[PDB]
Symmetry: D2
């Protein structure tokens, strides 16, 4: 097929969005001005499996502008924004995705990107193992023609590692997930901004003066706490890792166990990425009308089945907002049914944060492709100098003035004027 | 007529809204558990003129629950939430209000609240001066029958002082507007919570890393500055008063003139309450896609007409979000048409802030009513013990444990154990 | 006598300090550039009772530089810095003060400033009742020749008020203590900077990760909390006033009672200005080696007698640092023996803050003297425009750019381009 | 000789110091209560070369309490606190150290720690490389007798890598310098606490309202910026690395070049660790009385010679505080002669930060010693479970309640309940 969007008529609407986003995504735009001549991806036939949204569309066109031939599929049945896919389809790009697909239409869409006008894909841009998987299990003949892979998710990267272990990984991968520019944004900065958006949009609740308990103090936890803290709330953190617990303490946050914190919190945010964070025994302790939500792993953190199964009432107050009544007579306001509150009750992360994650994708794609034999099969990390590069693509928009190391300082520090500035073990 | 609501069908739904807001309006709830049995307002016939909302309905039932007789109407033609009005009328309270009234129906609505079964109104609860102006200008027969006035707005209060200056004021008034609990929650705390919600709902923009220029550093300016700062923006302040300016400087904020700041910021917030804050000469200097919103005085602060008259294009991006292309090639994203961004792009202030302003009002009603021979015709401030009292009604929900001064300490401090704890010139 | 310093030889050492301070005290220096021509105090014969320190010395010379004839005495037997008094004495100014005087030498010193070469004092600049008192009870003949008084302490002002009440106040006063520029600095900004200085210098203790309980949340408590909070500690506040308790809560601080907080705090700071804040019953609860100190009222806040009388051991670890051993086997580190920790274990407030407090003194002196009959007997507040003036004397050093109201905005706001910008009830 | 301390008379006083520091060094205290009975270091003959301080003494007694045989010396000629040295010697531990040693006595002091009654050293605990270099260059006979090396400095560690690169390293080493708990407390947290202390002790200057320019934004830069920020200064960052620079921008800090910042700041802090940060061309642009200090690399960051060779005057205001008059009329206040302000003008890092660096050392010692056939000749990192372990030894004093992962969650997360909790590439 030429492509498949829900309403190509929505294409004019999307472009308008794409163009506003471009301003907030200076990364992908610098890639365009830096390479839309050298056309570095000239030759690449990139199959991409990634949520078809405005930001992703801006990514796609950056790939296309750098000389890449591209076919796209959304890695989530609902994540795709139709006016954005409409614009791409209209742009003459083979996009197969609409909001509200079936598992059937989903697998179909992905398969629809494997074959180009002059041969099958020779590159992969994945979010969530799916694309690398489908080809690995149901189309292994293609593997040899694929020069590389770029993966930007925890899941996908664990898989590339598992697959590697089992010797299934046939094509070299580049883990963009752990880039400091991708992680700090996708995790810390994104959640810091979008968390309170979900809460306010869903409840319009005053945050100042409330006690907010945050399970987990990893990047997402650090951002969620900082955010709440700046609003006027008393953040209590819970942790299993002594190093992360120490960091919380050093910053002035109380750190206890949920078994205790549940009796004190007014808002509860989970960040763990692990099961059984908030249980029935916790709900029974909570104050009347506590707001409970999650921004870590899709629904495995809060025990919603208990709420559904033990509450005396449940009344949907609005989309993504339920308020249960317990036998103790206390209500509990649950957000997005335990799913992600920022994507579920708000719009998820700002374009600027996507600019960092997606610019990481472009950086991987250009490197793998332009580097035929330097990367062995297996999941490798994005070379730091490239990581430094995506950071540098955003200064400017931020009106930051990087100072240049002089030849004398360079030699003194024993580092190139623009080569990597920190060793591979440097935690920033 | 017994009432006049756009639709009494939303009543059952209005109640739903009310029973949820009550939880965030502990001020109104303590007033009840504290005076509903005793009925201090027993005998008062209160005419109220104040935006008919969920939060205001909670207030009304509090006044009613204290032995008051009440007739109500809005103080703005649109402000009135119909399901809230419907439930008030459904409860048997005479409310003459609906969203979208014609200027003609508004006056009529006020007229209805002036007479009760047992007689005319003997108490005014105003927000704006409308009721008090109407009663004076068009109903002076009633003046000698009204025991007291209760006002909570700057416009309304200025009006009172002006009438009194002209010797036209004939009934004592209490200015609840300048109570620390009214002012702090309405100006400082309210806008701190909501400013960013407006900007995000309208633009979904990343705040961190942006230079935000806030004009003014009064209560609104302080809250707006603090908010943006907690998000990661580099706030720059502008001011005319050396003291407020010094306060900003002492907190780490740069303080300049708009004439210089315009060349730098990405987000502009007005908090002044004065005219001609952002003129075209400034717009011509702004960076591409600067966001310019106002949260101070409705429309006077930004030169919107200039935008309208000098932009090459103008496109509505979504309700309350407009984007102008200027002759220099830059785009100016203007929010709420230069009107209050919190009210125009968000949902205004949280119930909790309302709980402070309204408890201040219940307080004023109770006191004026209960001390007929206490207040000379004039516009007085709320006794500090009452201001502290409204503050205390909220401790508790805040999980605050207030300590009680012993008799020795009270004696050492020379203040009553419960009596006011600060002199009238105490700025908190 | 010509004067009386401990060691005039120390006079060269002083001038060196005076000159460095001048830089951080832009206020008194702008007074000099604005008035060392008009010589507004020409004629005044100012007797001054203020701690003879370097800052005060910079003050004195400003007075002298503005045409004033001056005689000085220190309002505290130990507060006087000899190299500073030495420079003044050397400069040809009658200063009678040395660190470590007797109550006898103290009263003597004060009397030594009542008479000038050409008659007795005609002005008074006091800090702590003393000067106004001595003349009022032991030299009432002088009262008539005294044109005005400037008082800048809570004590002194309560007294001016009490005296006024009793009809004893013969000469008009101006309370500089409550100026927003004097108060915010003397209380908020000063203590915020100096508190941790005392604790660190005395203990060299890590602040981050500790629970710090602050009694009181007025200006001093706000500053102390903010200070600790920025170092990484978890500040718990205790209050008797509901309004101040609300402010703490709204800022994210837990607010309890000392009865509870004593069991949790690692550092304790009292800000109250009231007796019995920390008692024996609290020490018995405290964690091992808690650091307890005070920065409010001299010694009445912490129960030191209990510590002395119940501890099993006490060992002075260094000047202003005692460590008690309780019967429970827990130690308690006490600072400056319950006296002010910033003055006692550090250097008190920075010059820039004294600049604000003292410039208020110069302001009052110039106003009273220059305004022969506009001030009736009684303690008056420093007119706002003068308060705005001292604020503006410091912008510039701070490199702040005040923006000027245009004639159009001025009229719109109904205020002068430079006249007072806020009403008398404005709490900043 | 059994030891060699400048004076063993301070012993009883040293102990006093030690018994106080112990409370703030829970890491060392837990190792004892955890391993003193079991004596894991039983048999080890540890030669240690580390600044002989109170904090270091606590460490020594810990290694001792764990069954280790120890001989010690400093790793700097001045660093060694004599009363601390005296107490260790007084307890029967062979310490060869005193403050103010000649370069010649230093080498000798080291030599002493090389031989024990039962034989030569079989373990190295080094701070700087000296011991390890001396053993290699001057005592290779001993090499095959030493089981392992423990190093905690950048210099020392770079040395290990270099020797290992030249194939000279003959004994395995563990780099405790790059453990998160060592780095975070030494670079980030330590400096955060002490930087401002240095500036205050040296200048007693008001920080709020000043523009502070921090050169660099690594761990030291981060803590220094955060510190100054909490005081009310407007921090401006300078950086060569795009990522760190983005990090600063994402927090609100302006990022420019020193070439521009010099014209604006009032306080200047270097954190770079690189040469030529503040040159004469910058000095000539600074405002009057700017403060310029260094907290990074000893003396290389600021061009002091320039000051010395181009200032018209130069005056020592107090130890470690010098002030230069430049030909342009401005004065430059330089602290610690361009050396580490925290150590030169304050008391260095708090015991608690040292408690982290040293528990890291006890850890490495215990591990290498207890795993003879585990480490290949080379410089390794501290196993993450040990790093998490030193972190946990401090939770507790911090009033932190670490939660334990259930077997289910453990299995869901795919990590041991106690085992490491993050991959090696995890940047906290
Ligand atoms: N937009 C979004 O909503 C969004 C964005 C990015 C990442 N995430 C997801 O959020 C989750 C956390 O990501 P992160 O990057 O912050 O992870 P991380 O590994 O940095 O942090 C996880 C933290 O949770 C802690 N934790 C684990 N089990 C715990 C337990 N049972 N109780 C308390 N604390 C516990 C861990 O110790 C760890 O410190 C992941 O699921 C990530 O995939 C969501
Ligand atoms: N919900 C809302 O959106 C909401 C809520 C409360 C108040 N307000 C309105 O917001 C505005 C500000 O109120 P406030 O309580 O903060 O007032 P305020 O008087 O406390 O603060 C106004 C400040 O703006 C400064 N200012 C005046 N003219 C200026 C100029 N021309 N340039 C720069 N700075 C200037 C003044 O010095 C003053 O400090 C008012 O109109 C107020 O009524 C809006
Ligand atoms: N350099 C210094 O150390 C310095 C400087 C300025 C002022 N002060 C002094 O410190 C004290 C505080 O002054 P301020 O300006 O902050 O005062 P304030 O009047 O603004 O605040 C005092 C606070 O203490 C609270 N309080 C009273 N009794 C209390 C109690 N028993 N328990 C808990 N809270 C209690 C009060 O409610 C009040 O909020 C005063 O004695 C002042 O004279 C010290
Ligand atoms: N007690 C103390 O005073 C103490 C304690 C620990 C570390 N340090 C020292 O402080 C220094 C910094 O250590 P760190 O841990 O922060 O290191 P780091 O590498 O983490 O930080 C250094 C940063 O400075 C930046 N930088 C380098 N050259 C620059 C230049 N020319 N101009 C501007 N920015 C530049 C780099 O990009 C880097 O981000 C080191 O010398 C370290 O050894 C001092």
């Amino acid at each position: 097929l030429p492509y498949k969007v829900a309403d190509i008529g929505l294409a004019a609407w999307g472009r308008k969005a794409l163009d506003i986003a471009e301003n907030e995504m200076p990364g992908l735009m610098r890639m365009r001005e830096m390479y839309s001549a050298s056309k570095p991806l000239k030759g690449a036939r990139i199959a991409g499996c990634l949520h078809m949204t405005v930001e992703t569309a801006v990514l796609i066109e950056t790939l296309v502008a750098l000389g890449a031939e591209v076919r796209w599929s959304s890695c989530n049945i609902f994540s795709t924004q139709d006016h954005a896919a409409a614009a791409i389809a209209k742009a003459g790009i083979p996009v197969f995705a609409w909001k509200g697909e079936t598992d059937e239409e989903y697998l179909w869409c992905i398969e629809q990107t494997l074959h180009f006008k002059d041969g099958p894909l020779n590159m992969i841009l994945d979010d969530g193992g799916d694309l690398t998987n489908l080809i690995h299990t149901k189309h292994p003949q293609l593997l040899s023609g694929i020069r590389g892979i770029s993966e930007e998710t925890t899941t996908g990267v664990h898989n590339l590692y598992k697959m590697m272990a089992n010797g299934i990984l046939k094509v070299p991968a580049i883990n963009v997930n752990d880039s400091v520019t991708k992680s700090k944004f996708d995790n810390l900065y994104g959640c810091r901004e979008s968390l309170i958006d979900g809460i306010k949009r869903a409840t319009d609740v005053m945050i100042a003066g409330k006690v907010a308990v945050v399970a987990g103090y990893g990047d997402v936890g650090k951002g969620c706490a900082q955010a709440l803290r700046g609003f006027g709330a008393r953040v209590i953190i819970t942790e299993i890792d002594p190093i992360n617990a120490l960091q919380a303490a050093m910053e002035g946050y109380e750190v206890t166990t949920m078994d205790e914190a549940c009796k004190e919190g007014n808002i509860f945010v989970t960040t763990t990425g692990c099961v059984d964070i908030i249980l029935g025994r916790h709900f029974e302790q909570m104050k009347d009308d506590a707001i409970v939500c999650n921004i870590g792993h899709f629904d495995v953190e809060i025990d919603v089945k208990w709420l559904n199964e033990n509450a005396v009432e449940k009344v949907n107050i609005k989309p993504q907002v339920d308020r249960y009544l317990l036998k103790n007579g206390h209500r509990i306001i649950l957000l997005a049914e335990g799913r992600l509150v920022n994507l579920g009750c708000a719009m998820g992360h700002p374009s600027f944060v996507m600019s960092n994650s997606f610019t990481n994708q472009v950086m991987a794609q250009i490197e793998l492709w332009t580097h035929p034999d330097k990367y062995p099969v297996g999941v490798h990390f994005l070379p730091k100098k490239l990581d430094e590069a995506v950071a540098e693509a955003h200064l400017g928009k931020l009106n930051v003035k990087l100072t240049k190391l002089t030849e004398k300082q360079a030699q003194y520090l024993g580092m190139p004027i623009n080569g990597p500035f920190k060793p591979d073990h440097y935690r920033y």
